[PDB]
Design a protein around this nucleic acid. Structure first.
Ligand SMILES: [Mg+2]
Ligand SMILES: [Zn+2]
Ligand SMILES: [Zn+2]
Lengths: 1112, 101, 14, 170, 221, 111, 94, 147
DNA sequence: GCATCCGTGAGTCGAGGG
DNA sequence: TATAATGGGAGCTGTCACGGATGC
RNA sequence: CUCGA
């Protein structure tokens, strides 16, 4: 169908690769395509450079490294639950200083995980994502003292775990102090150690009135740098002997040592820019020619004394400013844990050099790869910023890789984060999306990168702008930092332009984020697009300008919760970004070059290019993702089809013809229906389930292990004690469920038999054994069955046996069986539906087609939405989506309406007019006039002022259609609704939250080991937790026996719950509850604290609640 | 070994009997007495002593024989006829079949 | 405060 | 954490009386399971308790006669509906359950205010009072229809709101 | 009969401020520092907001959500405090037999401090309705006996007599003056506000009081 | 009887020894190969009671007919295994040690 | 709402005393197999089954209806607890 | 609350405020064993004062003492209620030293032990109530009459 | 009398996931 | 069972308010 | 920790 696009804004540049923040960072760190001699000092290369050489053989030195090919491909790794990684080899040489002997060898350091093409990782078979982190950029900062107005604090901040923060404060007594590891000492003392003299400090710092007299201490200048160094050492190290060489080593490490103290590369530039100096190294000082040489200390103290005195040119700093905040990408976060793991290997090296023979040693003997593997293995497994990938739809994956977290290791702890870190800073513009962010406690901590935004080599985020010279807007695009941007005046993207020249004599612009109205002469730069202000998901919301930010947040966040539907359709009204997202997410298959398609198959597509070469593209089909949604590729092309470069081949999951499809386009009628849509609830037509709208495929993986025990080995077998053929019907010879069989709750997936525990038959068992004359079997039924409320058709079986080629399991494990059970989920009652505007609700009712409100021509509506949802939420976008969707219904055309530049009301009115001629005009040609019911509604409309009195019925119906309203007939009556109802097409998605997964119930079941209270969780078949606030509820009602029930019979009372279940099944009332077991645990846990807890009667005589069991 | 606090909330208690099993053993002990009441006070007692439903342990044919006073040959066929009369009462009523698992 | 340092000091007495 | 409890997504029934709530069959079968076994023995649906339990273990082994038995079980009895957080005592209320097809719990519109529960995907937990005492406490004191007013104010807590008010005003 | 207007008036959905944004100007907005932007959005959601106008607004929206987030944590803490302090309080008896009471004022000093004016209706009902008179009250030729539970109409009557200058304050049995040990009595507490009748002995008012105070804790801005 | 009161107080070493069913001498848990309680260890059945209901360690007395009877060979009492959640052990220190609660809780109760 | 619940709250000096009375009576009926009921055959609460009307299995339902008739006596220390138990077991065997 | 449009009865607040005034400080021992500066409940000091006055002794001079809910909760007589709240270590130590006995007066105490809360259907007021039909009531009345 | 270091708190329920 | 060697390494910190011991 | 309310 034809697609009409609106807006006058022409994007000069397209969107940058969206996954580049992941891919480019990890490529920058690895440098695997770079020859070892051409590698820079950045990345894992740096880690070798910092760690080596290792002295005190004697010297073990680093040469170069390399990365071998992965032992298993990506798909095979997910299968065997291995990690996709490359082997790391490093060439080292052992050098004895005295002997001169040189032994060189290439050592194996273990494997380093590799990032996939799309920007994610595979760890132990599970796809994971490394979330970028945001923190305070290293450098020198100055902030106003909260306690002392007019006085300021100098803060020198290095990288995380790169060494301590340092504070320079002017004390109430006038002296200038320094804070290191929470220690207050006069800065003058350290200055002497740097070699400074009163002669130098007076000329330099004397220009600032009476700040220099707090720096003057005669006792400090009365001693040489060697004496003051030992003086400082005693202050910072109580109890440690003040040895001269141990004093130098501490200060050197604390200050001059690059191997320990390191400012960021950005931290260096930030210090240079702020202090107006140049840093030789990345440290605060240097050890040169036997002494210490100052770098950052003097210019910092100079800047503080100038700011305090009021000397112009010195201002405080905004720590929330995006120029002072940077981003730690996947490459930097991995490097640090690689840097730590390397230093741990170094500690093993120096320890190895002290032991063993001093003559014969090889780099292979010294190097233990274990501490390096562990540090990496932990970072891709147990790290906070390493998260389980969200695969639910292709947009979920793209957004997850574009996330920014202020939390995590080295970042802000929760109790630390206030309003300031959470707030949207004026510098977030074009960089961090103001819309997308979690609801609740996570707000402002987790954000999303802007569409056009870019993270530079220094870690800061840059946004594009257009060069404007003399009122002429060029195509030159300049990515600026938050600091660079503040220097100019930047006009808005919608600024009127005739050709390349500014049309308006008054334009809207920003100066340091502050909006201002200026002339074309005063305009230095111009926004590229309105798209640069918002994230990817927020840019998928049409008519965003008509939606309140709070609901747009939800509409944005809920698109990633969208479940791919078998029938899924692209939105009738789009933002135009639907194509790029599909491409960058690598969901769809595309044509590499020009050529002709040789073959088209469900599993396969073969293409012959202009080169003449035959390229076979295998198609991913019904693969289970992380969240359990089905990921499959459907070929969009036919045999012999001529295709160009970049042309669609196969449609990925949640995609239609190369466009992003998160849901269905349905015809909605906005009106209350019988309290069924009451409070955000939704009423849907049964016609949706008939044509299979909102139906998705879901897969659930089941696993079981046979292991060797001391009672004998467990085994997968078709022989299960005490089971009929009916139970074993779909099981194969080996005891595994066949492919294509329908499984229901209680059915057996994989049969397994384990030897019974050592068993003393009770008298009831021995007598029952002799009655039926049957010997008790050795094994018992351990078989893996289907968990209650689950089921489907088994599409796959995977079996790994010990003693078989390519198969080695964990110790003790014989064989591991994996059963993949898929399902086809129809939309039902309790499933959650939502639109792109933030409107969301569960379906409360499904009406048969004849009960649905319908059009005059007989066409019933799909979804009935409650109009009460609109006014309080203030999102009008769905209303405009519906109006324009109405026209698209009868015009058979979709629309591209970009954010903030799109179809205005009159433009939609023009389309609705054309829609009316097709809708109504068809009727008058079919030989039908106006219905009686239509006139009754028109009479009502005249009273409503929706139509102008006196016009013909047709002219008034058109006036209603232009308002997007139509005459609606109740299906139950046939009588019309007393007024015209807004009806049109809307794009609605099915969210991942479904009633099938969320329903749970328990009578009795498993209990925790100690507490003896029901387990938590659905998978464990546990009970619902009744908390403190719920106990208060029963208390406030005053129901004691309902409360005493929850505290005893239903949870922890072992005598009570056993007696209760037996009472009910016998048809007897439940017995009086006894003492809860968790209280006895409390008593005993208190006894371990040497506290005597005595339960006493009214006579103060102890009462044993353990019934003589614990008393000798 | 690994720490419980790493995770202990995901671990079931396999030792103590669930109310289902507790009631199952209780309904078994009652149904057995319903079957043994259809026998004589002796042949029901011999079966209880032979399988140890009284003092908890299973006596030999000499001890049950000496308790009742009869020869070991006699007390063994009293056990048999009590077991045979239980087999006939079981095939008719079919009450104890469900407990055989 | 630090048990190790306190021990190393008592060792430095002899 | 307690036994005889379950949870699911809530959906508004219009048709429920103020004292009623839709309770899914599959949940009620599990929640009332010890009672259901007893009723099954009182009828010819099963020889004994253990035979009846094994009958319900497999879904395909569940026939039509057991539901009609379950209806007799829950007659006159009430469950407890609760939504977190519970700010005040009305965060838990007593309802006479009505078996429904589907996996969703049905909630009466007028008590939504007291629960502060909307239809946007809120879930609620079910609790079943066992003893004749706990059923007497629930029915008399904790019944939704038995508390019409707020203990904090004394103004009506359950009152027309949203669509009901819009319809009356029209 | 305009749909937005109807829902606003009826009390079904929306308030004047929310309706204004759909029709009139969006209004003034806040800088992240709490300062207010000199330039308000002149747009309405009907008309649509520019990309700059949208961005200016997100400062407040973010501040608002983050405020609510950090607020609910502090409200929940307060609620738990109130419960733990008031939990042992339950009505243990019909009457403690105290001669002590509190005087509920119907008049509050004006901010001009010119004179005394009548308190708002809602405020008087809050400290009057459902409480027991500790002394005989004769107003407007009506006798309200000592020991009487004041109904809603009994309160509106007392308001009328106040407007007539007959009664400036109402003696009332209060938990402040209640002498009952380990809790309160029936007379001092007054009505059970749920049943609009005298409180049933054995009712725990402590938890009820704590919950009542805590509940709209997330509502306080 | 019915409990009307709960009292908490200080436990004397003699009181502590009275609760104790034995001293745990060895810092051992279970035998590595047999996965059974080590003698005089933390899990020892001689002290804290039997693992299996009414059954000793060696298996000499397997039935309820022996109750309160302490086996001669393995020294394990024959009784319900539920007592393993109940019976206290004790450790006798060579030198007295202060209870940290009465030290670091300010102001110190010992101080 | 429970039928005549307004009247029941008038019979008692506390809303909770009503519950204790209703609950205890519901236990007396269950234990004695509803032989002690003060309800006439036409006053019997009925449950509609697949077949037809049958007695209401709910003991609490009956208790509330019995209480409405005023044929039950409630209060404290009317009869010794143990003596009250066996006088019912004599009249209505369990 | 009024500012936010929340209708709330004054008496609810009065319950809490009452618990804030629950304690007093001694300005002089008089004839008692009490100490100057010692803090105790207003109930127990007046109960001692009426005993000393009845004994003709000198009553204890005390001061009204206001404390916030958090402190009032930890200052409660029941140690089970206090330790279940916060500062468990500080609470348990002083409770163990004094050999304190909990009478289980409040709700929280009984909730822990799993006993019947002294409120509503579990209140001693209504919990001893008996139910008897006239047929049974007259059956016992004749047994009493014959004896 | 009054600054300062230490210890103690900082919402509920339910999924998933390592 | 015997060259002789004799003082550790770890360390990123963006909140608030309370009582209370600690010091000038 | 990430989500749902
Ligand atoms: Mg909700
Ligand atoms: Zn009183
Ligand atoms: Zn033994």
């Amino acid at each position: 169908m034809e697609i009409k696009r609106f807006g006058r804004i022409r994007e000069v540049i397209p969107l940058p690769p969206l996954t580049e923040i992941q891919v480019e960072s990890y490529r920058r760190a690895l440098q695997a395509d770079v020859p070892p001699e051409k590698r820079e000092n950045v990345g894992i290369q740096a880690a070798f450079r910092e760690t080596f050489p290792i002295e005190e053989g004697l010297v073990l030195d680093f040469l170069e490294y390399r990365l071998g090919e992965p032992p298993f491909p990506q798909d095979e790794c997910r299968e065997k639950d291995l990690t996709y990684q490359a082997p790391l080899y490093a060439r080292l040489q052992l050098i004895h200083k005295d002997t001169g002997l040189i032994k060189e060898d290439e050592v194996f350091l273990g494997h380093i995980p590799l990032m996939t093409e799309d920007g994610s990782f595979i760890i132990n078979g599970a796809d994971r994502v490394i979330v970028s982190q945001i923190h305070r950029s290293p450098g020198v900062y100055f902030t106003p003292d909260p306690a002392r107005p007019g006085r300021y604090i100098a803060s020198i901040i290095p990288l995380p775990k790169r060494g301590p923060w340092i504070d320079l404060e002017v004390e109430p007594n006038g002296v200038v102090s320094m804070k290191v590891n929470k220690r207050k000492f006069p800065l003058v003392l350290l200055l002497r150690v740097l070699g400074y003299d009163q002669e130098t400090l007076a000329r330099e710092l004397g220009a600032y009135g009476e700040l220099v007299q707090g720096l003057m201490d005669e006792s400090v200048f009365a001693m040489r740098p060697e004496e003051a160094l030992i003086r400082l050492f005693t202050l910072l190290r109580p109890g440690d002997p003040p040895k001269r060489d141990k004093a130098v080593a501490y200060v050197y490490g604390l200050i001059a040592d690059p191997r320990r103290y390191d400012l960021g590369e950005a931290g260096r530039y930030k210090a240079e820019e702020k202090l107006g100096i140049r840093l030789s190294g990345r440290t605060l000082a240097r050890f040169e020619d036997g002494e210490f040489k100052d770098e950052v200390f003097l210019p910092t103290l100079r800047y503080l004394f100038a700011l305090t005195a009021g000397v112009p040119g010195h201002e405080v700093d905004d720590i929330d400013h995006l120029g002072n905040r940077r981003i730690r990408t996947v490459g930097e976060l991995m490097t640090d844990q690689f840097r730590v793991g390397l230093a741990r290997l170094a500690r093993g090296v120096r320890e190895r050099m002290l032991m063993g023979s001093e003559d014969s040693l090889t780099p292979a003997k010294l190097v233990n790869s274990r501490p390096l593997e562990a540090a990496i293995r932990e970072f891709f497994s147990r790290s906070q910023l390493s998260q389980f990938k969200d695969e639910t739809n292709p947009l979920s994956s793209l957004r997850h890789k574009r996330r920014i977290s202020a939390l995590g290791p080295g970042g802000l702890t929760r109790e630390r984060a206030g309003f300031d870190v959470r707030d949207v800073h004026r510098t977030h513009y074009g960089r961090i999306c103001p819309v997308e962010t979690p609801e609740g406690a996570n707000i402002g901590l987790i954000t999303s990168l802007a569409a056009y935004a870019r993270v530079d080599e220094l870690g800061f985020i840059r946004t594009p702008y257009r060069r404007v010279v003399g009122g002429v807007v060029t195509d030159e695009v300049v990515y600026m930092t938050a600091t660079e941007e503040d220097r100019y005046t930047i006009a808005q993207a919608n600024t009127p332009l005739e050709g390349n020249r500014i049309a308006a004599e008054r334009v809207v612009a920003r100066r340091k984020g502050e909006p201002v109205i200026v002339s074309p002469e005063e305009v230095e730069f111009m926004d590229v697009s309105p798209k640069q202000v918002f994230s990817v998901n927020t840019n998928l919301i049409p008519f965003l300008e008509h939606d309140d930010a709070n609901r747009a947040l939800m509409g944005s966040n809920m698109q990633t919760q969208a479940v791919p539907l078998i029938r899924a359709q692209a939105p009738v009204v789009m933002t135009g970004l639907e194509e790029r997202v599909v491409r960058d997410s690598l969901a769809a298959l595309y044509a590499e070059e020009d050529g002709e398609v040789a073959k088209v198959d469900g599993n396969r597509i073969v293409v012959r290019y202009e080169d003449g070469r035959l390229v076979e593209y295998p198609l991913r089909r019904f693969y289970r993702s992380n969240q359990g949604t089905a990921l499959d590729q459907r070929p969009r092309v036919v045999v012999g089809q001529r295709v160009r470069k970049g042309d669609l081949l196969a449609d990925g999951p949640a995609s239609e013809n190369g466009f992003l499809a998160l849901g269905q386009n349905v015809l909605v009628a906005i009106m209350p229906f019988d309290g069924y849509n009451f409070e955000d609830a939704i009423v849907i037509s049964e016609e949706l389930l008939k044509r299979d709208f909102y139906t998705s495929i879901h897969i659930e993986r089941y696993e079981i292990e046979a292991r060797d025990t001391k009672l004998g080995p467990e085994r997968i077998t078709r022989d299960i004690p005490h089971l009929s053929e009916a139970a074993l019907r779909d099981l194969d010879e080996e005891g595994v469920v066949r492919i294509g069989a329908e499984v229901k709750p209680g059915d057996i997936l994989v049969g397994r038999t384990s030897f019974k525990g050592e068993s003393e038959p009770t008298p009831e068992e021995r007598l029952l054994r002799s009655i039926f004359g049957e010997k008790a079997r050795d094994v018992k039924d351990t078989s893996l069955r289907v968990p209650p409320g689950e089921g489907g058709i088994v599409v796959r079986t995977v079996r790994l046996r010990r003693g078989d080629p390519g198969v080695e399991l964990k110790p003790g494990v014989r064989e591991v069986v994996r059963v993949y059970v898929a399902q086809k989920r129809k939309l039902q009652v309790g499933d959650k539906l939502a639109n792109r505007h933030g409107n969301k609700g569960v379906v409360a009712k499904i009406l048969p087609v004849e009960d649905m409100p319908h059009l005059p021509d007989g066409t019933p509506v799909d979804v009935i939405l409650n109009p009460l949802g609109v006014p309080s939420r203030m999102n009008l976008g769905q209303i405009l989506e519906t109006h324009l969707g109405l026209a698209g219904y009868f015009l058979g055309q979709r629309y591209i309406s970009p954010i903030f530049d799109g179809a205005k009301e009159p433009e939609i009115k023009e389309l609705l007019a054309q829609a009316f001629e097709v809708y109504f005009g068809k009727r008058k040609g079919e030989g039908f006039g106006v219905d009686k019911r239509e006139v009754e509604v028109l009479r009502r409309a005249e009273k409503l002022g929706l139509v102008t009195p006196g016009k013909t019925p047709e002219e008034q119906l058109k006036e209603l259609f232009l308002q997007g309203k139509v005459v609606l007939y109740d299906g139950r009556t046939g009588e019309p609704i007393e007024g015209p109802i807004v009806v049109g097409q809307m794009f609605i998605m099915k969210l991942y939250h479904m009633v099938e997964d969320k329903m749970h119930a328990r009578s009795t079941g498993p209990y925790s080991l100690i507490t003896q209270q029901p387990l938590g969780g659905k998978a464990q078949f546990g009970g619902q937790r009744f908390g403190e606030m719920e106990v208060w509820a029963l208390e406030a009602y005053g129901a004691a026996h309902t409360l005493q029930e929850m505290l005893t019979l239903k949870s922890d009372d072992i005598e009570g719950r056993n007696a209760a279940y037996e009472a009910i099944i016998k048809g007897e009332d439940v017995p009086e509850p006894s003492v809860p077991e968790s209280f006895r645990v409390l008593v005993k846990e208190l006894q371990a604290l040497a506290l005597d807890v005595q339960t006493l009667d009214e006579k103060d005589n102890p009462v044993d609640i353990f019934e003589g069991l614990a008393s000798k | 070994p690994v720490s419980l606090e790493t995770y202990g909330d995901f671990i079931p208690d396999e030792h103590l009997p669930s109310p289902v099993d507790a009631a199952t053993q209780s309904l078994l002990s009652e149904e057995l007495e319903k079957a043994l009441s259809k026998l004589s006070e002796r042949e029901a007692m011999v079966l209880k002593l032979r399988k140890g439903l009284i003092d908890g342990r299973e006596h030999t044919l000499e001890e049950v024989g000496a308790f009742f006073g009869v020869t070991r040959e006699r007390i063994r066929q009293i056990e048999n006829k009590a077991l045979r009369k239980l087999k006939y009462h079981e095939s008719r009523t079919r009450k104890l079949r469900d407990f055989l698992d | 405060s630090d048990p190790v340092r306190q021990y190393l000091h008592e060792i430095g007495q002899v | 954490r307690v036994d005889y409890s379950g949870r699911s997504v809530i959906v508004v029934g219009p048709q429920l009386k103020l004292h009623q709530c839709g309770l899914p069959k599959r949940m009620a079968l599990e929640l009332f399971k010890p009672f259901l076994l007893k009723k099954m023995e009182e009828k010819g649906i099963a020889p004994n308790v253990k035979a009846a339990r094994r009958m319900l273990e497999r879904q395909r082994d569940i026939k039509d006669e057991v539901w009609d038995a379950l209806e007799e079980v829950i007659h006159g009895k009430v469950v407890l509906l609760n939504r977190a957080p519970t700010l005040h005592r009305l965060g838990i209320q007593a309802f006479q359950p009505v078996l429904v097809e589907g996996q969703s719990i049905q909630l009466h519109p007028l008590v939504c205010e007291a629960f502060n529960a909307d239809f946007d995907g809120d879930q609620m937990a079910v609790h079943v009072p066992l003893s004749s005492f706990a059923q007497a406490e629930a029915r008399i004191q904790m019944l939704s229809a038995h508390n019409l007013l707020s203990p904090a104010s004394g103004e009506p807590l359950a009152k027309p709101s949203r669509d009901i008010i819009l319809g009356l005003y029209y | 009969f305009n749909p937005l207007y109807v829902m606003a008036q009826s009390g079904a959905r929306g308030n004047p401020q929310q309706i204004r944004q759909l029709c009139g100007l969006r209004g003034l907005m806040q800088k992240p520092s709490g300062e207010t932007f000199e330039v308000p959005v002149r747009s309405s959601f009907r008309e649509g907001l520019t990309v700059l106008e949208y961005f200016i607004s997100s400062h407040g929206a973010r501040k608002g959500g983050a405020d609510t987030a950090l607020r609910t944590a502090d409200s929940g803490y307060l609620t738990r405090k109130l419960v733990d302090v008031t939990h042992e309080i339950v009505v243990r008896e019909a009457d403690c037999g105290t001669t002590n009471y509190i005087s509920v004022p119907l008049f509050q000093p004006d901010e001009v401090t010119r004179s005394l004016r009548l308190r708002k209706r809602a405020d008087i009902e809050a400290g009057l309705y459902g409480r027991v008179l500790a002394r005989e009250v004769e107003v407007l030729g009506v006798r309200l006996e000592e020991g009487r539970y004041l109904s809603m109409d009994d309160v509106h009557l007392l308001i009328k007599a106040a407007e007539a200058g007959e009664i400036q304050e109402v003696p009332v049995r209060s938990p402040l003056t209640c002498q009952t040990r380990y809790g309160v009595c029936q007379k001092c507490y007054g009505y059970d506000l749920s049943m609009a009748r005298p409180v049933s002995i054995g009712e725990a008012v402590g938890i009820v009081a704590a919950q009542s105070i805590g509940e709209p804790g997330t509502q306080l801005t | 009887k019915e409990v009307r009161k709960v009292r908490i107080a200080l436990a004397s070493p003699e009181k502590i020894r009275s609760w104790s069913y034995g001293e745990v001498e060895k810092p051992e848990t279970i035998n590595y190969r047999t996965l059974k309680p080590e003698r005089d260890g933390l899990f020892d059945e001689r002290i804290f009671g039997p693992i299996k209901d009414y059954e000793c360690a060696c298996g000499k007395y397997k039935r309820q007919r022996f109750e309160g009877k302490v086996c001669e060979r393995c020294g394990v009492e024959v009784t319900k295994s539920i007592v393993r959640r109940y019976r206290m052990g004790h450790i006798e220190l060579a030198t007295p040690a202060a209870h940290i609660w009465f030290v670091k809780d300010v102001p110190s109760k010992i101080g | 709402a429970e039928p005549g619940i307004d009247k029941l709250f008038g019979m008692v000096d506390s809303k909770y005393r009503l519950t204790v009375v209703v609950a205890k009576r519901a236990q007396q009926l269950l234990r004695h197999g509803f032989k002690n009921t003060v309800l006439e055959p036409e006053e019997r609460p009925k449950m509609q089954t697949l077949e037809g009307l049958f007695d209401d299995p709910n003991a609490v339902t009956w208790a509330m209806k019995e209480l409405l008739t005023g044929r039950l006596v409630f209060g404290e220390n009317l009869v010794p607890e143990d003596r009250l138990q066996k006088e019912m077991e004599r009249l209505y065997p369990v | 609350y009024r500012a936010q449009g929340v209708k709330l009865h004054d008496k609810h607040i009065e319950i809490v405020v009452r618990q804030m005034m629950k304690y007093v400080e001694v300005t002089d021992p008089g004839d008692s064993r009490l100490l100057e500066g010692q803090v105790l409940e207003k109930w127990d000091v007046e109960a001692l004062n009426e005993r000393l006055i009845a004994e003709g002794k000198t009553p204890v001079a005390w001061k009204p003492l206001l404390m916030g809910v958090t402190k009032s909760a930890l200052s409660t007589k029941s140690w089970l209620s206090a330790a279940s709240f916060q500062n468990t270590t500080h609470v348990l130590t002083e409770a163990a030293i004094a050999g304190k006995k909990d009478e289980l007066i409040g709700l929280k105490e009984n909730v822990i032990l799993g006993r019947l809360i002294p409120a509503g259907t579990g209140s001693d007021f209504v919990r001893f109530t008996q139910v008897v039909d006239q047929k049974t009531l007259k059956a016992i009345e004749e047994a009493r009459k014959e004896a």
